[PDB]
Design an enzyme around this catalytic site. Structure first.
Site, PDB file in Angstrom:
ATOM      1  N   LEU A  77       0.830  -1.196   0.000  1.00 25.77           N
ATOM      2  CA  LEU A  77       0.000   0.000   0.000  1.00 25.77           C
ATOM      3  C   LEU A  77       0.867   1.251   0.000  1.00 25.77           C
ATOM      4  O   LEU A  77       1.937   1.280   0.617  1.00 25.77           O
ATOM      5  CB  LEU A  77      -0.934   0.015   1.212  1.00 25.77           C
ATOM      6  N   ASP A  78       0.399   2.283  -0.697  1.00 19.92           N
ATOM      7  CA  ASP A  78       1.099   3.558  -0.736  1.00 19.92           C
ATOM      8  C   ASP A  78       0.831   4.354   0.540  1.00 19.92           C
ATOM      9  O   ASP A  78      -0.035   4.012   1.351  1.00 19.92           O
ATOM     10  CB  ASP A  78       0.671   4.364  -1.964  1.00 19.92           C
ATOM     11  N   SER A  79       1.601   5.431   0.716  1.00 19.86           N
ATOM     12  CA  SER A  79       1.425   6.289   1.884  1.00 19.86           C
ATOM     13  C   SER A  79       0.051   6.949   1.885  1.00 19.86           C
ATOM     14  O   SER A  79      -0.592   7.072   2.937  1.00 19.86           O
ATOM     15  CB  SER A  79       2.528   7.347   1.926  1.00 19.86           C
TER      16      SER A  79
ATOM     17  N   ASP B 182      -2.629   5.719   0.648  1.00 24.82           N
ATOM     18  CA  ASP B 182      -3.577   4.697   1.075  1.00 24.82           C
ATOM     19  C   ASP B 182      -3.529   4.502   2.585  1.00 24.82           C
ATOM     20  O   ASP B 182      -4.557   4.236   3.217  1.00 24.82           O
ATOM     21  CB  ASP B 182      -3.297   3.389   0.343  1.00 24.82           C
ATOM     22  N   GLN B 183      -2.346   4.650   3.185  1.00 22.55           N
ATOM     23  CA  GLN B 183      -2.248   4.572   4.639  1.00 22.55           C
ATOM     24  C   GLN B 183      -3.009   5.712   5.306  1.00 22.55           C
ATOM     25  O   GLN B 183      -3.706   5.503   6.306  1.00 22.55           O
ATOM     26  CB  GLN B 183      -0.782   4.579   5.069  1.00 22.55           C
TER      27      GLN B 183
END
Ligand code: CDL
Ligand code: CDL
Ligand code: PLX
Ligand code: PEE
Ligand code: PEE
Ligand code: PEE
Ligand code: 8Q1
Lengths: 128, 603, 178, 103, 88, 459
Positions: free
Chosen positions: E42-44, E46-47
């Protein structure tokens, strides 16, 4: 483009709109690191004094004593008679007194003249 | 003999017994709120008797029972006035307060200091009853200050919150600004009319001058939160919901208006003050409705609606209809208190959530609150034969059919339209759309206390207008003949506001987003009045209080002039005199000079 | 809140903060869920157009005009959670938060009630007392010369040791004491 | 990004200590050791201790003390209408001027 | 209030529920200790979207300095339990 | 009148002969009994006065002040008993001796049928206060404060004496009764102007006037709790009593000469009320509040109307009680905190609820909340000033607004909010402090039931 926000005294510049923040440099980074080091040292000292179980009193805050002393007891010894200070003191300490004196004197002479001519209609005026 | 006096004093007397028992053992148990609620209900059902006697006969009284200090020709006594206004307002206030404490039983169920909360509510009720029944200006001032202090204490109920203390101090500040005019009126009345009694004041003032009426108007603007001193009423929503429902919506905030009702014999003889009152009411109601139509906090919307209704009341006073303004007070108490109770119920059900952006489908999720809020909004906007109709329709007719200013009438009509607009905004944004609250649903209404408290005020908001209007004697000439279009002006304005605001709100579903305009920002930020007026003056005061008053004059110049100059001069003279090297030659030469001067000067 | 602050904010932290603020204010603007979802996905697509950009000067030019645009359309009355620093219940229960040392001033008749609680409290006080001398030493031996550089405290490294300066973090009153 | 290992370990230890303290905050079934020592009916008694007695006291104070002094209690002089009679005098107010009645 | 005393079991159940409704993650591959940047890819952004989902689910907002360094669901449940003072 | 003076004199032998651990109990009991005895002086007449003898007489202006002076001593002893715990028996007896001497001097001053005797006792009250301030004071500045509190007073009082004896050379008698009955108008002359100034500034300096208020914050801050109580409650009222007694001979020159002092007081009330808003010290804030109230009293006395005098008497009594209570509460905070700073210790309502209630009541009664006698005096003075001139109402209302503002600011800063974390020595309030607060506050709410008892001879 969008209309620009204009800062004022009671509406300061936003943190994310300061041109200085985006001008990053090694000197600025070093200054911020030193500031955080000072804050960390002070916080460590405060926590060391705070979590001690033997301490059963307030933790003396030299910043607070300095603030109170500079506010109260350090004013006169650093005072110097200056045209700014002399003029401001004369204004704010004399002008209101003479202004209110003139206002009340004019009102009371008007009332006294009206009483002397008898055209005031002081009926039912018993308590004074 | 004549049970009217005994009953009308007994109600207020028995209102004070739980305050006496607050030091007893019952105050330390959990039955204290029930004790207070039962006492209030008994007081209401006991005060229902003087109302019946007045409706039967029209009986009025003055009870000057205890004699206080007498000051030369001025006599001060504990005197209570039991005219139509007092004997009509007391039962309504007691009914609303009974409903409010029954609601607070459930709303304050988890508050550790609930007995103290009920004691504060009872003390506020006692102070307001003192204010309403007062026959002289000193007792009226006592009530004026008691209600203000109780409001200060109840706004800052959660004293660990900074904003609550700030709001309480704001309310105190604005009420003291009104106190200035109140004290001016008291001083003028004593100086010229030689008394503070209402009878002597009415008698000796056939044509009342400007100054006492301007003082009364300033006090009324301060207490009723008119346009100049409005923001404290919106800011007072920091307190608990029962406090906002009882004090700052229906009972306390009308007090200033009541004051102008009490001095209506002097009001009608002055034209300039009437015009000022009408203009202030019109601008207040317009501005408050315009601020309301764009808020997201439900409590803020209800408070702004209350302020708009107060402005309408002030307009009615300005157009020489004090009795109609009193009737509006009576109806507004009912339906606004019930509206705030519905808001508090919804607030509690959604886990202390106040913004309308997180409130979705509640028409079916909570039906009793839905029907109560619908009935209340219909009464507030004005539906024929409801409790709001018998007041607001006559308000509009009297405004239209009398010699007023065109601008005030226009702003009254626009304020009615905006009232409809924010009512439909509340209903649409809180009851119609899809749910937007957090997934953990905690919606519940199965509690007899809340249901009973809401339904009592529901029956009130449906029947009380008709019952009271058909029961009281006629007090003004009716507008029996009317243009057909001008008979329906209020109805068409309300319907137009409803339809236009519904159409505007229905466009939020559209998948299009545009940045706000300047009018939206002006209306949402309360005309920017709270910003500037709470940042520019205060700072400019406080800074001065430390720069000129404290440091420049008190610490420097006043110190420089008398003490420091004396110290410096004495030090210099002492140094000059005492600095002698001890050489007798100089002293002997000085003695020779002195001898020569004495021989050449003293003969 | 709990985590110690850093000397400065990096570019990625700033862009993440702007993304958070922009999405929150867009949700405030878009009341309904489907509209917010559509416009939030549109905003995410607008943000990820320049994700792979490499020039630092152009990157700094980015996020800056974005912050200006955000300030122009920042929804002057945004949504705030009730317990957040701007919410309606930010400090509602701070008046019920009483310190732990107050119990040391209770009357013996009051301590007669709840005896087990005060016994456990005595064990806690002894544990704090025995533990404290060791904690000071750990802090003294672990702290770099010239004073700390970041207000981050080290964990306990031995068996019987406890995290330095732990007493007032473990003994918070409650979130809702009453 | 994320927690450093020392941060992880310190958070774990502080969290377990906090959980132990929170568990210690609970009460045993005997914890409130209260020491005992002494030395329609509800509404029926309430209506006589909170209503009837105040009415008695206030009625006595008004009828026998307040009304003793003059002008302390002043009435409204109820309205007199044509066709009415007065108990004190027995005389009847004469009727009105017989205006033309139509609709 | 009338709010039930939520437990870490309920908190972890709700967190895992929210993460399973995240269509970018296969529910059968997620785990309590599964990392976000590496184990789930997951990308940042998405976090931070996950952080927003947690905030809108639990009714409170996590400060950004604490939110940006939460990397697995286990730490999120631990942080929420510390925030709400959960016993068992 | 000797039925009050002789027990006060016997208080000294009793204290000295008292056991080393029974001084406080005996002093408090007998002081309360003497206050009960002095309560009999309240029974005044609508006629001239209670002329006991050639040397002492009573009046309904002197009676409430005498009752307050007799009542203050037990409260002063109760407040002082705390911080003198580690102090030797001889010096504690000396402290009690100073308090008794001050009370005796005040009691003899308030009767004072002759003006020279009044001046002698009015200046004799200075020595015990100076000794108390400069001996049992904490800070190093106390000495300076004492010097100020001395010389200011004398700078105003030495000319008065001259004027006094001059009057006896012209009138032939300084007895108050003969002076009242044989009063003659003052011709508008330079000599009469200077005699007016000599008679007036001695009492104006002790109120104090806005220009001459510098000594008061220093004296109040550096003095101990008993010194602050006696300065705020009784010693400030000597100037008002002297002015009301001496303005009889100053007419009709008072009409012209009242203008500078009226303007100074009407603006200095606003100045001091605004100064109260920005203050980092509790004692200094209370002192400036006292300055504002006494400026209002000065305005009342200069207006010279019956309502003015009634409001002035009521306001002096109410302000004395209120300021004593406020100083006591501040000292109770200081004894735990040892810093005397408002912002240091916060949220004390959470830890000390009953003391928070006492703070609330003190702030409310300082705020002039009706029907308290504070409000009665303030309203009477306001009405008299409005009759004097309708424009004064602006300044009066501004003063009321700022007074409420700073009173609630003082209450909220210290009682509301979050407690200071590092402070852990805040022990529960003792029975002595609560009893002191109750004994301070109950007389106010009892006197509001019988206002005519404190409204003076012009009632
Ligand atoms: C109203 C009718 C009353 C009839 C019953 C008689 C009551 C007699 C009380 C006399 C005054 C109390 C003594 C003062 C010290 C307080 C004692 C204390 O420590 O409490 C411990 C005790 C136990 O509490 P706790 O749980 O153990 O401790 C928790 C903490 O302390 C936490 O404490 P808390 O949070 O619970 O707060 C305590 C509470 C109470 O504490 C106080 O603050 C008391 C302050 C009251 C007045 C404040 C000064 C302002 C000047 C007013 C002067 C008027 C006095 C009249 C004559 C009085 C005779 C002595 O504070 C308040 O509620 C705020 C009160 C503000 C009201 C403002 C309105 C003022 C004017 C009202 C009208 C008065 C004249 C009416 C004329 C027309 C009608 C005939 O609490 C009480 O006993 C409460 C007292 C009841 C409330 C009294 C407030 C109204 C009374 C006004 C004066 C009397 C009026 C006479 C007839 C009126 C008709
Ligand atoms: C004689 C025949 C009688 C019949 C006459 C004809 C019948 C009626 C004809 C219709 C006339 C207009 C009716 C439409 C009203 C406008 C509604 C609208 O479109 O709003 C959206 C639109 C902007 O929306 P947005 O910014 O995109 O908001 C984003 C979302 O919508 C955010 O949405 P949200 O979810 O946050 O909340 C939505 C909310 C938020 O919407 C708003 O922002 C509200 C702001 C505008 C609406 C306020 C209109 C009330 C006007 C009173 C002004 C009094 C004078 C003030 C003087 C100001 C001086 C600067 O909107 C509403 O809920 C409803 C708003 C109120 C509409 C319903 C009631 C108004 C109709 C009544 C007007 C007259 C009929 C009276 C009947 C009696 C018979 C005489 O508003 C406007 O474009 C403004 C239109 C009119 C504003 C006039 C004031 C301009 C002042 C500039 C300077 C002027 C010269 C001053 C010189 C001074 C130098 C010294
Ligand atoms: C510093 C903080 C406050 C301390 C106390 C301050 C208050 C004391 C001020 C005393 C009041 C003023 C003194 C004299 C007032 C008399 C009225 C006079 O001002 O009006 C004119 C007087 O004219 C001029 O004022 C002449 C006097 C000018 C000399 C005075 C110096 C002016 C400023 C000095 C101020 C310093 C005062 C403090 C010294 C330490 C009227 O002219 P005229 O009708 O013909 O005289 C009438 C009087 N007669 C009948 C006896 C003859
Ligand atoms: C209560 C327990 C006892 C119950 C049995 C007794 C029942 C009543 C019989 C008592 C006898 C009547 C009585 O009390 O005497 C009247 C007596 C005063 O005597 P007067 O001569 O009329 O006036 C004073 C001047 N001489 O009145 C009283 O004191 C009792 C009732 C007075 C009112 C109650 C007090 C409430 C208000 C308190 C003061 C409020 C502040 C001041 C008011 C400001 C108004 C502008
Ligand atoms: C004609 C002559 C008139 C004389 C008037 C005398 C006024 C009475 C005060 C006399 C004080 C003179 C002494 C003096 O000030 O010395 C400076 C001295 C230096 O301190 P020391 O302790 O001496 O040494 C420190 C270094 N080791 O300064 C001070 O401390 C002064 C502090 C207290 C000042 C007292 C207050 C005096 C002002 C009040 C009003 C009186 C003014 C005079 C009358 C006014 C005209 C009507
Ligand atoms: C806190 C500090 C305040 C200081 C107070 C000082 C103000 C008092 C006025 C100055 C002192 C004057 C004392 C005079 C005592 C009264 C006696 C009197 O008035 O008799 C006059 C005497 O009047 C005088 O001699 C007064 C002359 C003044 C000399 C001293 C000057 C002191 C400073 C004056 C300037 C300050 C003026 C205002 C001061 C206000 C204080 C701030 C008549 O004289 P005969 O010769 O008998 O008349 C025969 C013909 N018909
Ligand atoms: C209603 C409110 C309106 C608000 C308007 C806001 C307008 C927003 C417009 C934004 C314009 C831009 O793209 S500004 C672009 C700023 N410059 C960059 O992004 C360069 C490198 N980016 C990064 O490194 C990031 O961290 C990233 C790789 C994305 C993630 O990293 P992670 O791997 O750690 O998740």
């Amino acid at each position: 483009s969008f209309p620009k926000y204009k800062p004022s005294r009671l509406a300061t510049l936003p943190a994310t709109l300061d041109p200085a923040e985006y001008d990053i440099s090694p000197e600025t980074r070093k200054a911020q690191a030193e500031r955080l080091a000072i804050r960390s040292r002070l916080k460590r000292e405060y926590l060391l004094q705070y979590n001690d179980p033997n301490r059963l009193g307030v933790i003396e805050d030299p910043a607070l004593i300095r603030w109170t002393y500079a506010r109260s007891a350090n004013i006169y010894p650093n005072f110097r008679p200056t045209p700014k200070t002399s003029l401001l003191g004369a204004l704010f300490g004399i002008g209101p007194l003479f202004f209110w004196y003139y206002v009340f004197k004019t009102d009371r002479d008007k009332k006294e003249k009206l009483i002397q001519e008898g055209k005031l209609d002081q009926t039912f005026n018993i308590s004074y | 003999m004549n049970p009217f006096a005994s009953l009308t004093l007994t109600t207020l007397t028995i209102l004070t017994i739980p305050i006496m028992m607050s030091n007893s053992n019952i105050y330390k148990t959990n039955l204290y709120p029930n004790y207070v609620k039962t006492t209030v209900s008994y007081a209401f059902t006991l005060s229902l008797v003087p109302l019946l006697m007045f409706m039967h006969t029209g009986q009025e009284m003055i009870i000057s029972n205890w004699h206080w200090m007498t000051l030369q020709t001025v006599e001060l006594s504990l005197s209570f006035k039991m005219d139509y206004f007092s004997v009509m307002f007391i039962p309504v206030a007691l009914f609303v307060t009974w409903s409010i404490m029954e609601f607070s039983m459930w709303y304050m169920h988890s508050d550790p200091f609930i007995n103290r909360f009920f004691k504060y509510l009872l003390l506020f009720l006692i102070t307001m009853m003192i204010l309403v029944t007062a026959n002289n200006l000193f007792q009226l001032f006592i009530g004026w200050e008691g209600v203000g202090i109780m409001s200060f204490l109840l706004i800052g109920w959660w004293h660990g919150r900074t904003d609550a203390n700030t709001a309480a101090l704001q309310a105190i500040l604005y009420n003291r600004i009104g106190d200035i005019g109140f004290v001016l009126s008291m001083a003028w009345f004593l100086t010229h009319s030689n008394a503070w009694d209402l009878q002597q004041i009415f008698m000796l003032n056939n044509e009342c001058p400007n100054m006492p009426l301007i003082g009364l108007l300033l006090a009324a603007a301060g207490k009723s939160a008119q346009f100049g001193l409005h923001p404290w009423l919106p800011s007072a929503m920091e307190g608990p919901t029962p406090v906002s429902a009882l004090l700052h919506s229906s009972t306390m905030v009308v007090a200033g208006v009541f004051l102008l009702i009490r001095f209506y014999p002097l009001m009608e003889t002055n034209k300039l003050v009437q015009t000022m009152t009408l203009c202030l009411g019109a601008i207040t109601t317009l501005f408050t409705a315009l601020c309301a139509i764009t808020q997201n906090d439900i409590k803020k919307i209800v408070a702004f609606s209350t302020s708009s209704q107060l402005g309408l009341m002030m307009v009615t006073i300005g157009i020489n209809q004090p009795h109609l303004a009193f009737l509006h007070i009576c109806m507004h108490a009912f339906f606004k208190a019930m509206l705030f109770m519905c808001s508090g119920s919804i607030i509690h059900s959604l886990n202390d959530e106040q913004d309308i952006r997180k409130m979705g489908g509640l028409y079916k999720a909570m039906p009793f609150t839905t029907t109560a809020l619908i009935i209340g909004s219909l009464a507030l906007t004005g539906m024929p034969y409801l409790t709001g109709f018998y007041s607001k329709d006559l308000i509009i007719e009297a405004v239209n059919m009398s010699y007023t200013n065109a601008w005030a009438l226009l702003m009254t009509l626009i304020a009615t339209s905006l009232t409809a607009a924010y009512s439909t905004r509340i209903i649409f944004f809180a009851f119609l759309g899809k749910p937007r609250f957090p997934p953990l649903v905690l919606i519940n209404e199965n509690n007899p206390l809340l249901i009973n408290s809401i339904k009592r005020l529901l029956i009130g908001s449906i029947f009380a207008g008709f019952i009271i209007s058909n029961n009281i004697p006629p007090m003004t000439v009716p507008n029996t003949t009317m243009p057909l279009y001008m008979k329906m002006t209020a109805l068409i304005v309300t319907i137009m506001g409803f339809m236009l605001a519904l159409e505007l709100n229905n466009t939020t579903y559209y998948l299009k987003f545009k940045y706000p305009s300047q009018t939206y920002k002006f209306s949402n930020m309360l005309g920017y009045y709270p910003s500037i007026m709470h940042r520019l003056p205060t700072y400019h005061n406080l800074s001065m209080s430390q720069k000129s008053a404290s440091s420049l004059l008190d610490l420097i110049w006043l110190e420089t002039i008398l003490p420091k100059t004396t110290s410096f001069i004495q030090m210099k003279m002492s140094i000059m005199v005492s600095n002698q090297k001890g050489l007798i030659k100089l002293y002997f030469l000085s003695f020779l000079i002195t001898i020569m001067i004495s021989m050449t000067l003293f003969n | 809140a709990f985590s110690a602050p850093a000397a400065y904010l990096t570019h990625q932290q700033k862009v993440l903060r702007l993304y958070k603020r922009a999405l929150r204010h867009l949700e405030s603007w878009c009341v309904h869920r489907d509209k917010y979802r559509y416009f939030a996905c549109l905003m995410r697509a607008r943000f990820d157009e320049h994700k792979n950009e490499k020039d630092m000067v152009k990157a700094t030019q980015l996020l800056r005009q974005a912050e200006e645009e955000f300030w122009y359309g920042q929804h002057p009355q945004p949504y705030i959670f009730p317990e957040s620093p701007g919410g309606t219940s930010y400090e509602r229960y701070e008046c019920y938060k009483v310190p732990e040392w107050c119990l040391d001033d209770w009357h013996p008749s009051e301590k007669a009630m709840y005896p087990d609680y005060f016994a456990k409290r005595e064990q806690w006080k002894r544990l704090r007392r025995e533990s404290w001398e060791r904690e000071v030493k750990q802090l003294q031996e672990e702290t770099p010369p010239g004073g700390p550089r970041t207000e981050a405290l080290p964990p306990a490294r031995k068996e019987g040791d406890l995290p330095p300066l732990w007493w007032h973090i473990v003994t918070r009153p409650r979130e809702r004491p009453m | 990004s994320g927690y450093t290992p020392d941060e992880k370990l310190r958070l774990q230890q502080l969290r377990e200590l906090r959980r132990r303290w929170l568990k210690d905050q609970e009460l045993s079934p005997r914890e409130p050791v209260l020491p005992p020592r002494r030395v329609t009916y509800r509404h029926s008694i309430f209506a006589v201790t909170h209503v009837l007695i105040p009415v008695w006291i206030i009625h006595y104070y008004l009828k026998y003390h307040v009304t003793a002094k003059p002008y302390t209690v002043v009435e409204r002089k109820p309205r007199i209408f044509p066709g009415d009679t007065i108990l004190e005098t027995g005389e009847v107010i004469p009727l009105m001027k017989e205006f033309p009645d139509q609709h | 209030s009338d709010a039930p005393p939520l437990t870490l079991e309920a908190i972890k159940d709700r967190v895992l529920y929210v993460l399973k409704l995240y269509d970018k993650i296969d529910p059968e591959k997620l785990s309590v200790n599964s990392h976000f940047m590496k184990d789930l890819g997951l990308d940042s952004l998405d976090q931070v979207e996950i952080i927003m989902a947690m905030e809108d689910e639990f009714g409170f907002e996590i400060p950004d300095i604490d939110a940006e360094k939460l990397m697995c669901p286990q730490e999120i449940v631990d942080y929420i339990a510390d925030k709400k003072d959960v016993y068992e | 009148m000797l039925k009050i003076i002789i027990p006060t004199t016997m208080l000294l032998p009793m204290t000295w002969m008292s056991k080393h651990n029974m001084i406080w109990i005996n002093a408090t009991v007998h002081s309360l009994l003497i206050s009960l005895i002095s309560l009999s002086l309240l029974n005044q007449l609508g006629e001239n006065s209670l002329n006991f003898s050639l040397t002492f007489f009573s009046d309904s202006l002197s009676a409430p002040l005498l009752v307050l002076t007799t009542w203050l001593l037990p409260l002063m002893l109760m407040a002082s008993q705390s911080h003198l715990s580690k102090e030797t028996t001889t010096r504690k007896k000396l402290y009690i001796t100073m308090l008794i001497l001050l009370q005796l001097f005040l009691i003899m001053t308030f009767t004072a049928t002759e003006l020279i005797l009044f001046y002698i006792l009015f200046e004799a009250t200075l020595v015990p206060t100076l000794i108390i301030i400069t001996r049992w004071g904490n800070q190093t500045e106390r000495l300076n404060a004492g010097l100020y509190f001395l010389f200011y007073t004398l700078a105003g009082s030495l000319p008065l004496l001259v004027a006094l004896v001059y009057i006896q050379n012209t009138t032939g008698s300084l007895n108050f009764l003969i002076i009242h009955y044989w009063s003659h108008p003052l011709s508008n002359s330079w000599s009469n102007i200077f005699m007016w100034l000599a008679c007036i500034m001695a009492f104006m300096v002790k109120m104090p006037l806005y220009g001459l208020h510098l000594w008061l914050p220093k004296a109040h801050v550096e003095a101990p709790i008993a010194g602050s109580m006696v300065l705020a409650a009784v010693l400030l009222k000597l100037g008002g009593y002297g002015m009301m007694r001496i303005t009889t001979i100053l007419n009709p020159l008072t009409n012209y000469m009242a203008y500078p002092f009226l303007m100074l007081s009407m603006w200095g009330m606003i100045m001091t009320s605004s100064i109260c808003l920005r203050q980092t010290d509790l004692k200094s804030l209370i002192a400036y509040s006292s300055v504002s109230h006494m400026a209002l009293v000065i305005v009342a006395i200069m207006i010279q109307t019956p309502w003015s005098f009634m409001g002035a008497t009521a306001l002096m009594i109410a302000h004395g009680l209120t300021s004593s209570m406020l100083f006591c509460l501040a000292n109770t905070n200081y004894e735990r905190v040892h810093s005397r700073t408002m912002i240091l210790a916060r949220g004390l309502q959470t830890l000390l609820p009953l003391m928070a209630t006492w703070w609330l009541v003190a702030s409310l009664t300082n705020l002039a909340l009706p029907p308290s006698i504070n409000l009665i005096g303030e309203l009477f003075i306001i009405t008299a000033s409005f009759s004097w001139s309708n424009i004064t109402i602006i300044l009066m209302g501004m003063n009321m607004m700022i007074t409420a503002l700073y009173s609630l600011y003082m209450l909220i800063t210290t009682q509301r909010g979050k407690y200071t974390h590092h402070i852990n020595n805040i022990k529960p309030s003792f029975t002595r402090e609560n009893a002191l607060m109750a004994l301070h506050i109950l007389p106010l709410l009892l006197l509001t039931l019988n206002p005519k008892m404190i409204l003076g001879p012009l009632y």
